[PDB]
PDB file of N, CA and C in Angstrom:
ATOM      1  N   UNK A   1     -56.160  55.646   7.147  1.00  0.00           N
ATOM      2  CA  UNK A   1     -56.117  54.187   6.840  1.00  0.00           C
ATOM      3  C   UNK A   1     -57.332  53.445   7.359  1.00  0.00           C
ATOM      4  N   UNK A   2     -57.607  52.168   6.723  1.00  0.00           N
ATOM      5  CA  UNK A   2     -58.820  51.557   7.003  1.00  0.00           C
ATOM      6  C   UNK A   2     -58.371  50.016   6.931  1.00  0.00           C
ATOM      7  N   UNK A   3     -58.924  49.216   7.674  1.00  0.00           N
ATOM      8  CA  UNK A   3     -58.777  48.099   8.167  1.00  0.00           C
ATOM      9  C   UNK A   3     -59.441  47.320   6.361  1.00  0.00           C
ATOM     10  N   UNK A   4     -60.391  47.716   6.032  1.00  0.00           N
ATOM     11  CA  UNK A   4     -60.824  47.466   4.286  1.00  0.00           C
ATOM     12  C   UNK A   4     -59.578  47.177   3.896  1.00  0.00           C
ATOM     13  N   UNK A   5     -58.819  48.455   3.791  1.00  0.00           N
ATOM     14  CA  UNK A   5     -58.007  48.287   2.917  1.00  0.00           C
ATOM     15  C   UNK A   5     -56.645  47.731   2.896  1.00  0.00           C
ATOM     16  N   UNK A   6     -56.246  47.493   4.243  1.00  0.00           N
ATOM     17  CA  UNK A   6     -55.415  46.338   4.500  1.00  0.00           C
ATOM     18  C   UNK A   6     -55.973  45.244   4.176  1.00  0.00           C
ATOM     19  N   UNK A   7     -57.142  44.793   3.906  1.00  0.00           N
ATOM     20  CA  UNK A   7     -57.955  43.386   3.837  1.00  0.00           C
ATOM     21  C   UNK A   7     -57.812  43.053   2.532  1.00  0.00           C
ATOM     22  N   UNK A   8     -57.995  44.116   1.820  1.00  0.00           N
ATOM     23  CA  UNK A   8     -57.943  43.803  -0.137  1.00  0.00           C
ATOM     24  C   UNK A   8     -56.799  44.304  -0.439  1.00  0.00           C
ATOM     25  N   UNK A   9     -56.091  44.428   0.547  1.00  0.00           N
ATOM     26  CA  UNK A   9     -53.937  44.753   0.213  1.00  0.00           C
ATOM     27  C   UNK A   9     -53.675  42.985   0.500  1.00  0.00           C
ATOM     28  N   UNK A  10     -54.438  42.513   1.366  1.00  0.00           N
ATOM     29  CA  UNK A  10     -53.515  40.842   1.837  1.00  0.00           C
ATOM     30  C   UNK A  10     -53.957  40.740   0.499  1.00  0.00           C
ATOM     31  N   UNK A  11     -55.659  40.358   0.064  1.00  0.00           N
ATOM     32  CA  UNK A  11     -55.803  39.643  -1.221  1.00  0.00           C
ATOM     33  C   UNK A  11     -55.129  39.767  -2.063  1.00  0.00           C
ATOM     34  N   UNK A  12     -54.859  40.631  -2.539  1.00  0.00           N
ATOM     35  CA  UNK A  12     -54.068  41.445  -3.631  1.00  0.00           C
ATOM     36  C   UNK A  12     -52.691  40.174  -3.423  1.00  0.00           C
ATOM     37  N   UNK A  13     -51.769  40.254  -2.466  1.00  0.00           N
ATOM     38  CA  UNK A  13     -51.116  39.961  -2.296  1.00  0.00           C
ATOM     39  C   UNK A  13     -51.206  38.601  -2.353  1.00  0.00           C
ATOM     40  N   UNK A  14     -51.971  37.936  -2.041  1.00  0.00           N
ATOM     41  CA  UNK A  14     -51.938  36.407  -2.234  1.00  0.00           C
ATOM     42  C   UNK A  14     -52.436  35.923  -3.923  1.00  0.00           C
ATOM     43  N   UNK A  15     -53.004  36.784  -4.203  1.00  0.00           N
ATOM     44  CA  UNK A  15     -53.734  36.558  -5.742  1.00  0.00           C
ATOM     45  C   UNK A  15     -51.954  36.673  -6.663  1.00  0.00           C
ATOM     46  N   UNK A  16     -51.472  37.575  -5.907  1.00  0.00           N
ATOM     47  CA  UNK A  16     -49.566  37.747  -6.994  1.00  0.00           C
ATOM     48  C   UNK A  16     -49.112  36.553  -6.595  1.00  0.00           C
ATOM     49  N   UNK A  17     -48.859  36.022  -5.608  1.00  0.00           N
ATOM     50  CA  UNK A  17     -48.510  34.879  -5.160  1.00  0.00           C
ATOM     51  C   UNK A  17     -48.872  33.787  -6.537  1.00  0.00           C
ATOM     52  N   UNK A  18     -49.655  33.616  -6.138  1.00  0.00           N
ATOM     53  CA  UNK A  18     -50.605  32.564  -6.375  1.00  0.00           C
ATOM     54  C   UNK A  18     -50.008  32.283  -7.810  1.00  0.00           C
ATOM     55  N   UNK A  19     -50.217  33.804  -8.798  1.00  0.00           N
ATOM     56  CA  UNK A  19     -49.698  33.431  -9.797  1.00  0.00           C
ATOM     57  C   UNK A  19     -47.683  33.130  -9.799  1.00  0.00           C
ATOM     58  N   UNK A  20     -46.987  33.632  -9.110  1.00  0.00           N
ATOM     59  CA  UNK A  20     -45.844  33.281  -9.225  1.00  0.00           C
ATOM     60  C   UNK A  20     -45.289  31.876  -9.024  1.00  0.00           C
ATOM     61  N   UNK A  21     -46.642  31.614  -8.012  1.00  0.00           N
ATOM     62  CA  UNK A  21     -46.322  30.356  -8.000  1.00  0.00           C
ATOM     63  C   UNK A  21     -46.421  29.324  -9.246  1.00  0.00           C
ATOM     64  N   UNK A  22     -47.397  29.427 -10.482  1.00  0.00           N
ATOM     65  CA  UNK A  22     -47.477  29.080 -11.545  1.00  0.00           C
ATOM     66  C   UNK A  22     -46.174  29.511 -12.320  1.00  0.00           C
ATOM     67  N   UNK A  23     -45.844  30.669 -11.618  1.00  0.00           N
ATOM     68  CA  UNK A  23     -44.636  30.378 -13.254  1.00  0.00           C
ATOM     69  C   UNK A  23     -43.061  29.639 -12.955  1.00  0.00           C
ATOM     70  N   UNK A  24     -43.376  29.506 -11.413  1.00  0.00           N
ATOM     71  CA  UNK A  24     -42.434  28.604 -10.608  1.00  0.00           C
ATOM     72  C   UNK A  24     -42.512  27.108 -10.753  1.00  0.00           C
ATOM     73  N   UNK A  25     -43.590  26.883 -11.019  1.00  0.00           N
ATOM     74  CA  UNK A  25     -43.738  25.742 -10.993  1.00  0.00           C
ATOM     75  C   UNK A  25     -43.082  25.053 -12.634  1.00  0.00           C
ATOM     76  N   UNK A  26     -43.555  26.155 -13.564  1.00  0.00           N
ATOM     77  CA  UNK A  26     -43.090  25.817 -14.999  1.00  0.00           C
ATOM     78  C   UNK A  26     -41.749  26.041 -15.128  1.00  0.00           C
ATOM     79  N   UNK A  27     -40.639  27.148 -14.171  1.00  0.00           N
ATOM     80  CA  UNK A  27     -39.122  26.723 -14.567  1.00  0.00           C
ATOM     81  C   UNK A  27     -38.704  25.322 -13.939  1.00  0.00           C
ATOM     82  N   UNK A  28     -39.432  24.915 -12.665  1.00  0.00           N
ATOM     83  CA  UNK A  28     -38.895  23.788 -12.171  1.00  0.00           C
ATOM     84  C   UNK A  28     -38.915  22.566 -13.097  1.00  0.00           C
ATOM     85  N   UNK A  29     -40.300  23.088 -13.639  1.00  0.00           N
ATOM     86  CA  UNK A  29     -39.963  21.174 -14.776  1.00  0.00           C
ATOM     87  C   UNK A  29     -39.132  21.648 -15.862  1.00  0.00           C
ATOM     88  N   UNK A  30     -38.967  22.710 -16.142  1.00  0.00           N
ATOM     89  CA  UNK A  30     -37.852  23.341 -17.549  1.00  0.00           C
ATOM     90  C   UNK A  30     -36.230  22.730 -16.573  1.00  0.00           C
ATOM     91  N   UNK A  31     -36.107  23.101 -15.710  1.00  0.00           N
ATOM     92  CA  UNK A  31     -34.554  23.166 -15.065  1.00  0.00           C
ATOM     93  C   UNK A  31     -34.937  21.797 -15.163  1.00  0.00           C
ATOM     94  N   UNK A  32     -35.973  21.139 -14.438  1.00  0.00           N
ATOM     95  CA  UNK A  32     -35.364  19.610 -13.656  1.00  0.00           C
ATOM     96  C   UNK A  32     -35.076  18.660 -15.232  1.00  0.00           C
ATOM     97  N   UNK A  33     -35.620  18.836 -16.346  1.00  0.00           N
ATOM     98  CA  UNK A  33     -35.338  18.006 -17.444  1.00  0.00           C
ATOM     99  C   UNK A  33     -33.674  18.604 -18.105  1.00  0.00           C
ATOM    100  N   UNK A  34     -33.889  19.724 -17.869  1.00  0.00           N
ATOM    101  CA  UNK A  34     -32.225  20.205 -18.698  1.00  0.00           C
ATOM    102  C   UNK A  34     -31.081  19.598 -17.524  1.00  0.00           C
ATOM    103  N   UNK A  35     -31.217  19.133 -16.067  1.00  0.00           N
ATOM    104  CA  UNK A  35     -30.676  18.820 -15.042  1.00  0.00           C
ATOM    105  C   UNK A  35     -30.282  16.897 -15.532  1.00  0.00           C
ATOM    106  N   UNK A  36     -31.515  16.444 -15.798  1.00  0.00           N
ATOM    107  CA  UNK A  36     -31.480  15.442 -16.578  1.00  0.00           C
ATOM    108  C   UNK A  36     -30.924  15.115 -17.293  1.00  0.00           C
ATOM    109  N   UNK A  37     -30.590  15.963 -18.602  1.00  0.00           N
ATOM    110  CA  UNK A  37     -30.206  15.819 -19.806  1.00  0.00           C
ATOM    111  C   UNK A  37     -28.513  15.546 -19.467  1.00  0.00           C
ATOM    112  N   UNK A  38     -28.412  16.741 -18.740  1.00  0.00           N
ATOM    113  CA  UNK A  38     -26.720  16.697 -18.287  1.00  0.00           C
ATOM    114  C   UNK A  38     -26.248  15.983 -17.884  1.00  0.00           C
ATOM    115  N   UNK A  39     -26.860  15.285 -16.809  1.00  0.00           N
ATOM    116  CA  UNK A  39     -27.022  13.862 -16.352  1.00  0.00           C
ATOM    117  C   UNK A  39     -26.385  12.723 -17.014  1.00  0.00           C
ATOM    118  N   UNK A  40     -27.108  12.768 -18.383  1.00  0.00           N
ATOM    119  CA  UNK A  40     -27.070  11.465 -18.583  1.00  0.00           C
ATOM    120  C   UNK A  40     -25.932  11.423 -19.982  1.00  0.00           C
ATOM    121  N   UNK A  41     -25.877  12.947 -20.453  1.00  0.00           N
ATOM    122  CA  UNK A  41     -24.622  13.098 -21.556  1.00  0.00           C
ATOM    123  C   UNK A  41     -23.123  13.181 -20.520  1.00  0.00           C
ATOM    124  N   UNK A  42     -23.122  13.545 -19.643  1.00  0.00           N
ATOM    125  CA  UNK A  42     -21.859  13.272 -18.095  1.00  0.00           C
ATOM    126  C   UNK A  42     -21.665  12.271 -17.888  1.00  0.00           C
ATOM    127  N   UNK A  43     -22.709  11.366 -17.995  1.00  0.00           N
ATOM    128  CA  UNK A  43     -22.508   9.939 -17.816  1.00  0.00           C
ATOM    129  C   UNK A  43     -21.694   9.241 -19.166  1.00  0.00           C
ATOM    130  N   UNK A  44     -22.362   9.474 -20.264  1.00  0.00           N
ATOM    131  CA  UNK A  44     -21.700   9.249 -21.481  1.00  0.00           C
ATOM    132  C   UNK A  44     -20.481   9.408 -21.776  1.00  0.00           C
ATOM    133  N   UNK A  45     -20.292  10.634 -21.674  1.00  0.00           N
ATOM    134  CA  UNK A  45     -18.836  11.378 -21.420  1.00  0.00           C
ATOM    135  C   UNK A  45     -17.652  10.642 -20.737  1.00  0.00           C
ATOM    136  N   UNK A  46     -18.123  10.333 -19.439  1.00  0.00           N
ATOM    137  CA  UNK A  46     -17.253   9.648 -18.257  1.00  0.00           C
ATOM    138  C   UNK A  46     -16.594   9.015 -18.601  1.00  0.00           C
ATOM    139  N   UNK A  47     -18.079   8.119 -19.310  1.00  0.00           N
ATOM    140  CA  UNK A  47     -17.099   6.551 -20.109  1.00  0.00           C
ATOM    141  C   UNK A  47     -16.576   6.545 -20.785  1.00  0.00           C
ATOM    142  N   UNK A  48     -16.576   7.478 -21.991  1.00  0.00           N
ATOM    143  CA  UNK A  48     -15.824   7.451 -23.341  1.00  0.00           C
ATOM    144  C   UNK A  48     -14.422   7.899 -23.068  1.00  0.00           C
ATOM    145  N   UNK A  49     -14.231   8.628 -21.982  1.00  0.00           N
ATOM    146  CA  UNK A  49     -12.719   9.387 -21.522  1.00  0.00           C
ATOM    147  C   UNK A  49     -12.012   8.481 -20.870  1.00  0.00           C
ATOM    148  N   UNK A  50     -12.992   7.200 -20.303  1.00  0.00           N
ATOM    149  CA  UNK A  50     -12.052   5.963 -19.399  1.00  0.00           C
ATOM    150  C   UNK A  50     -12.280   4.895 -20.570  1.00  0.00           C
ATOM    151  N   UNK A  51     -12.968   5.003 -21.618  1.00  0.00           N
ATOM    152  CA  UNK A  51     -12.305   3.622 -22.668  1.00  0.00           C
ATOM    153  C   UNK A  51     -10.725   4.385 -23.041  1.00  0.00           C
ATOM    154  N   UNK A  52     -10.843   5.702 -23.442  1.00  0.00           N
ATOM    155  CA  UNK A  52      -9.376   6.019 -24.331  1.00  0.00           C
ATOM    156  C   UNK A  52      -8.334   5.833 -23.456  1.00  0.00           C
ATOM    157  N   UNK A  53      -8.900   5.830 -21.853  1.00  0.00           N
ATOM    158  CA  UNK A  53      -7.369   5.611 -20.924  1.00  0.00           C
ATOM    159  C   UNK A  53      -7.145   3.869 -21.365  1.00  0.00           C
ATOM    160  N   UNK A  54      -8.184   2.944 -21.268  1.00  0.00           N
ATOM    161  CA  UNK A  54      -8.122   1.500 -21.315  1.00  0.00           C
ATOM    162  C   UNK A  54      -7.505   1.652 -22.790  1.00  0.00           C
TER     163      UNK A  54
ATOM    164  N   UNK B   1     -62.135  39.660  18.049  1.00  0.00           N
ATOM    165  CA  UNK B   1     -64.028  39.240  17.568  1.00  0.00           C
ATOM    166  C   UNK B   1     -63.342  38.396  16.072  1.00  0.00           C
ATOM    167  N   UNK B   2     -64.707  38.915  15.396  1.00  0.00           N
ATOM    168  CA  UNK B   2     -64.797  38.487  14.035  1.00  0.00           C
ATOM    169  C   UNK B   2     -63.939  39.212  13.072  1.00  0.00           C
ATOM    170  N   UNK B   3     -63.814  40.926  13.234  1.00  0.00           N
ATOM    171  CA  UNK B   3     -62.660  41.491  12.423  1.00  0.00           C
ATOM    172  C   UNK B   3     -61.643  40.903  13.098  1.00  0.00           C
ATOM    173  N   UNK B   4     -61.393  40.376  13.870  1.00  0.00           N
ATOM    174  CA  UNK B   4     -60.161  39.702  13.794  1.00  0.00           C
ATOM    175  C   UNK B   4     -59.646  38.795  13.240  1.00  0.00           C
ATOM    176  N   UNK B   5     -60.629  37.750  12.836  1.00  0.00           N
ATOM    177  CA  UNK B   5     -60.893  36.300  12.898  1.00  0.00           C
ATOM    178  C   UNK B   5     -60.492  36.740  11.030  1.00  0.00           C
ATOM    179  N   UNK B   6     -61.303  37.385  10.492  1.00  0.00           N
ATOM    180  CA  UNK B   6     -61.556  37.933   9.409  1.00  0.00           C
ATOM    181  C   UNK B   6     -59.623  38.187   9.165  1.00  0.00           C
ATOM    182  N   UNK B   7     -59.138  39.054   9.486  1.00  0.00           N
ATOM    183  CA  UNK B   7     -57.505  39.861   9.412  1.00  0.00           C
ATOM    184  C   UNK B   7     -56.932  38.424   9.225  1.00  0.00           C
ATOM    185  N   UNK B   8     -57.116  37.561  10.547  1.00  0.00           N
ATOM    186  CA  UNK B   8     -56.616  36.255  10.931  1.00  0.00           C
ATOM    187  C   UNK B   8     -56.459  35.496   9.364  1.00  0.00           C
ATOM    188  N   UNK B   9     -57.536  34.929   9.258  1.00  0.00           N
ATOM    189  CA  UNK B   9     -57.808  34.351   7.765  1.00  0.00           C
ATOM    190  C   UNK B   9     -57.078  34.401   6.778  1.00  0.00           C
ATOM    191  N   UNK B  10     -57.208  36.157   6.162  1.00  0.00           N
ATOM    192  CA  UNK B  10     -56.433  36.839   5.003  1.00  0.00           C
ATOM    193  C   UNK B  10     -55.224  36.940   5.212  1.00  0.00           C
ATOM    194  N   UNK B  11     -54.300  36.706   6.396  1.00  0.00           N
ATOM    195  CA  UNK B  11     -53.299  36.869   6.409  1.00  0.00           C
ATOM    196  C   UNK B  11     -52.363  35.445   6.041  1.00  0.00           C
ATOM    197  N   UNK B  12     -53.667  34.428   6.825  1.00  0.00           N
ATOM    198  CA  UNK B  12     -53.093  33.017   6.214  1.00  0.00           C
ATOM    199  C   UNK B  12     -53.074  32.412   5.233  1.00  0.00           C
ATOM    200  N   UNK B  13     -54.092  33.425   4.168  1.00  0.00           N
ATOM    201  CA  UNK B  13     -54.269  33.006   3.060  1.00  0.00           C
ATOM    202  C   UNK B  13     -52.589  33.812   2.239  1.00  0.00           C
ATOM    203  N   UNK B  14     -52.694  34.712   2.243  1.00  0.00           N
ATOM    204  CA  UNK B  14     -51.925  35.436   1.857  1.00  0.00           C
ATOM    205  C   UNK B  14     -50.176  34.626   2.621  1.00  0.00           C
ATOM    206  N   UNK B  15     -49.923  34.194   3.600  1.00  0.00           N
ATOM    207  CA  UNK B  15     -48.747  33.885   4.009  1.00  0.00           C
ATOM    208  C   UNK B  15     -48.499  32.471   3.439  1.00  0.00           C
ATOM    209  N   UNK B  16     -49.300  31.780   3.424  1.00  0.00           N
ATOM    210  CA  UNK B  16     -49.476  30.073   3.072  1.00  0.00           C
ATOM    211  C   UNK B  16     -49.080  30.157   1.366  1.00  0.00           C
ATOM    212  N   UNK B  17     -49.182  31.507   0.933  1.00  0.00           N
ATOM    213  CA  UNK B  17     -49.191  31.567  -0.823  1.00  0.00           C
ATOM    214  C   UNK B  17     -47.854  31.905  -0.861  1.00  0.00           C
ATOM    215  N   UNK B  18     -47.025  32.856  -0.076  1.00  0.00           N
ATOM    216  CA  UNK B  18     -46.173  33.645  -0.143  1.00  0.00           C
ATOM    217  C   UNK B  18     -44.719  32.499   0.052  1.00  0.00           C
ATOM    218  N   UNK B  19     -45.405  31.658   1.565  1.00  0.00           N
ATOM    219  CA  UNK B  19     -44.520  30.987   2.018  1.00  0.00           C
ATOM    220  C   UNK B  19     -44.153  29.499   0.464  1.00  0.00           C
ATOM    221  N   UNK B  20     -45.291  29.307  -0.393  1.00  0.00           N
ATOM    222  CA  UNK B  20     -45.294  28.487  -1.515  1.00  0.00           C
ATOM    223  C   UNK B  20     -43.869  29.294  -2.272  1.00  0.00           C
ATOM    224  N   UNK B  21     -44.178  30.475  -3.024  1.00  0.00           N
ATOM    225  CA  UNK B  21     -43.369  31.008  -3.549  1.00  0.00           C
ATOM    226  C   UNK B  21     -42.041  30.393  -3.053  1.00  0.00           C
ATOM    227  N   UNK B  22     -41.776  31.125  -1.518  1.00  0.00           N
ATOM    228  CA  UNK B  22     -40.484  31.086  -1.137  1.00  0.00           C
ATOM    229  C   UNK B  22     -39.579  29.373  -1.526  1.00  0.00           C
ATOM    230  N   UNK B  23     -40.596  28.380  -0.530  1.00  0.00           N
ATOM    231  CA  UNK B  23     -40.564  27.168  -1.266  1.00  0.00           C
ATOM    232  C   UNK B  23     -40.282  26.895  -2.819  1.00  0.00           C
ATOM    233  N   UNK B  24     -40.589  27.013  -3.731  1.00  0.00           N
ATOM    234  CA  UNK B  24     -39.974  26.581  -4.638  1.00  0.00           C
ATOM    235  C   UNK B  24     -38.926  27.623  -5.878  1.00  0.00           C
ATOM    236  N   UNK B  25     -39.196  29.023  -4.849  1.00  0.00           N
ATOM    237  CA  UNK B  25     -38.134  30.174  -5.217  1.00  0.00           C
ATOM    238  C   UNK B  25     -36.446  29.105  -4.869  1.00  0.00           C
ATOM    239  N   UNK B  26     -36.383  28.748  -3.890  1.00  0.00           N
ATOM    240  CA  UNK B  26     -35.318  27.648  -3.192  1.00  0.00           C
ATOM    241  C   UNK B  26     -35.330  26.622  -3.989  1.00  0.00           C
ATOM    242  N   UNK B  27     -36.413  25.799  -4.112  1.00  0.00           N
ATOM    243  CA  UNK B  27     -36.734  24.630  -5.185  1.00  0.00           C
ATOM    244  C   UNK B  27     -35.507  24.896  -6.666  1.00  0.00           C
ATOM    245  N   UNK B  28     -35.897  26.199  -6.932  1.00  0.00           N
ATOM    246  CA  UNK B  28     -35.245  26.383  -8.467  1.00  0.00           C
ATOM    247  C   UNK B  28     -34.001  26.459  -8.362  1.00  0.00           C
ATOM    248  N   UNK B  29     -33.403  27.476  -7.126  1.00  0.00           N
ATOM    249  CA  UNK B  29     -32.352  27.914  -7.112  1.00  0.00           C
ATOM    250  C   UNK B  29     -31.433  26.280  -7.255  1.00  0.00           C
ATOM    251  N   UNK B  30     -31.574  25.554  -6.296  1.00  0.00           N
ATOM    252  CA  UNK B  30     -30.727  24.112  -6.111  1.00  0.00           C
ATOM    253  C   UNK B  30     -30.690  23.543  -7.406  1.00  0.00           C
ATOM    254  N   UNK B  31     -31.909  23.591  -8.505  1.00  0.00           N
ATOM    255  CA  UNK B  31     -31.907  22.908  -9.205  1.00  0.00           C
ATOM    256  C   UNK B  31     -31.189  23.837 -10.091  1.00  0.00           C
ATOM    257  N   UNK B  32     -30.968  24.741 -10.427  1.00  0.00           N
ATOM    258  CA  UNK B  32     -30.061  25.594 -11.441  1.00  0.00           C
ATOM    259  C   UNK B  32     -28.284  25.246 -10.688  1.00  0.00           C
ATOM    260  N   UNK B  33     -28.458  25.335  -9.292  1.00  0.00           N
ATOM    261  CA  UNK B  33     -26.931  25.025  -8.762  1.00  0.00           C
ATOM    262  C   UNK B  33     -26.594  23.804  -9.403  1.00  0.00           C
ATOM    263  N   UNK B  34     -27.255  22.765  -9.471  1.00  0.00           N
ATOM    264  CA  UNK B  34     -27.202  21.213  -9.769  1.00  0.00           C
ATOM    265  C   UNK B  34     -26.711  21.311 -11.470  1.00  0.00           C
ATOM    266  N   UNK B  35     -27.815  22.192 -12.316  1.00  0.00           N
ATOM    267  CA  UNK B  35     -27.100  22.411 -13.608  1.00  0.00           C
ATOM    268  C   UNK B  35     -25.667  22.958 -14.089  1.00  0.00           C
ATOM    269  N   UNK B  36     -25.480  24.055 -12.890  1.00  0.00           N
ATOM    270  CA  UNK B  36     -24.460  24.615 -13.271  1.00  0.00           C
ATOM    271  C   UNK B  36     -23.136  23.529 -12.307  1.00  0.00           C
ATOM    272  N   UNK B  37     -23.486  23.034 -11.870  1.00  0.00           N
ATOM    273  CA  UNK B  37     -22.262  21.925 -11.126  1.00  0.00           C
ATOM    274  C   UNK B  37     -21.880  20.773 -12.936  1.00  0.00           C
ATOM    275  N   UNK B  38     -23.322  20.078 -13.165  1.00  0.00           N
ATOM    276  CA  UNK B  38     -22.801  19.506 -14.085  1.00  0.00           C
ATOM    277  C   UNK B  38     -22.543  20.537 -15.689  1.00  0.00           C
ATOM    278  N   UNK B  39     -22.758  21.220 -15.877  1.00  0.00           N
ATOM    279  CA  UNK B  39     -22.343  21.869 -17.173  1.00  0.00           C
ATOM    280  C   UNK B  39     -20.679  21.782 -16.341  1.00  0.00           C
ATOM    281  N   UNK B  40     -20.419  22.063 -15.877  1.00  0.00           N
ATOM    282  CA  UNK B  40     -18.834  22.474 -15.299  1.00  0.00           C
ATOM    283  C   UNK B  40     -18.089  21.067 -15.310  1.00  0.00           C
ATOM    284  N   UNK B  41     -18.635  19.746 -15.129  1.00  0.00           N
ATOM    285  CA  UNK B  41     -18.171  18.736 -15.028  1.00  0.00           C
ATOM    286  C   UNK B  41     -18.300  18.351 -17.233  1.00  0.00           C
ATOM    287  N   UNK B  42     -19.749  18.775 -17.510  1.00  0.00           N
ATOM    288  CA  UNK B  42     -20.039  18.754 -18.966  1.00  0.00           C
ATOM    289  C   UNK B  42     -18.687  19.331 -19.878  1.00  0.00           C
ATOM    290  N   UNK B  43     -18.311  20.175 -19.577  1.00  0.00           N
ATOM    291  CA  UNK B  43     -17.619  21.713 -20.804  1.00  0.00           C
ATOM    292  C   UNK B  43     -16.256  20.461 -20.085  1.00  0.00           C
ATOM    293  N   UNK B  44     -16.000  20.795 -19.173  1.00  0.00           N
ATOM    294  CA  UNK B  44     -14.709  19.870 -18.608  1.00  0.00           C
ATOM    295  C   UNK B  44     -14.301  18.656 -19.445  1.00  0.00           C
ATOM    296  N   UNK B  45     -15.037  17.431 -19.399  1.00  0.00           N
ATOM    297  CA  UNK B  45     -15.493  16.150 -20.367  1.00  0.00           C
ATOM    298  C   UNK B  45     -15.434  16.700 -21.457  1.00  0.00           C
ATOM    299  N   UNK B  46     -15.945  17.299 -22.223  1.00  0.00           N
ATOM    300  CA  UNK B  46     -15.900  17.303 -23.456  1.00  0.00           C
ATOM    301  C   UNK B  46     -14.865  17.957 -24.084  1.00  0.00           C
ATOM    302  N   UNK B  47     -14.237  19.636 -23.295  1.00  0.00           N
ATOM    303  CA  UNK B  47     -12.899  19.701 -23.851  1.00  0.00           C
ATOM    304  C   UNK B  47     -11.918  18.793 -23.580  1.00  0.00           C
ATOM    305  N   UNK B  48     -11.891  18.302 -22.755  1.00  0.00           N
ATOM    306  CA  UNK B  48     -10.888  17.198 -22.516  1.00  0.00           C
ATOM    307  C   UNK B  48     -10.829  15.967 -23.532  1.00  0.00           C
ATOM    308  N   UNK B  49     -12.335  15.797 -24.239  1.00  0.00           N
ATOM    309  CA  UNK B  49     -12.326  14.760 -25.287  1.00  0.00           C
ATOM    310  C   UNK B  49     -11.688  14.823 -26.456  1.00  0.00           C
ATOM    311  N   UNK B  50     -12.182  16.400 -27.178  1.00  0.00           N
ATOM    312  CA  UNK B  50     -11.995  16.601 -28.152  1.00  0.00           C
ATOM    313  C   UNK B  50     -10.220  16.875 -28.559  1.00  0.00           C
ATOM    314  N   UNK B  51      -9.376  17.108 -27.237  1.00  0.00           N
ATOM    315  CA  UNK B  51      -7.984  17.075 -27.601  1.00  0.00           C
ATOM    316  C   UNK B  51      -7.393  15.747 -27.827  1.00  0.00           C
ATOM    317  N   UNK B  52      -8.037  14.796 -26.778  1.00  0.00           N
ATOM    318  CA  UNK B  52      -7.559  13.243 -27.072  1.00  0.00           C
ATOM    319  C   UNK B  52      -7.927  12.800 -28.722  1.00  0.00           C
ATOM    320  N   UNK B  53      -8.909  13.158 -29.379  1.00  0.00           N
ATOM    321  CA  UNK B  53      -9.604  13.093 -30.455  1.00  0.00           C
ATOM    322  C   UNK B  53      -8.566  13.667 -31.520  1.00  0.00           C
TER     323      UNK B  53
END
């Protein structure tokens, strides 16, 4: 073993990172708008189930 | 020394990226819990509509 090659094993390792972090970043705005959506048809919902009680 | 300083560096580069991941690996998870809380309140509401209907 060589101290090299632990050195371009971290890079390696931060370069995978790096990209996971990109594809992390793209489910978070996919989830946080479908999180939204539910949101605001739950809200819809709510009300229409408490007019039919009124 | 300097191979140290050097190890030092790459490791923070490499942990500061890793520790990102972990961060919003967590980030997603809450936000999928949050979806699946309201789909469950969603499917709930809406079968419940469509029998009053």
């Amino acid at each position: 073993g060589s101290n090299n090659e632990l050195y371009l094993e971290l890079m390696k390792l931060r370069e995978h990172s790096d990209q996971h972090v990109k594809e992390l970043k793209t489910s978070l705005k996919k989830c946080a708008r479908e999180t939204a959506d539910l949101k605001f048809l739950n809200n819809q919902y709510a009300h229409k189930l408490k007019l039919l009680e009124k």
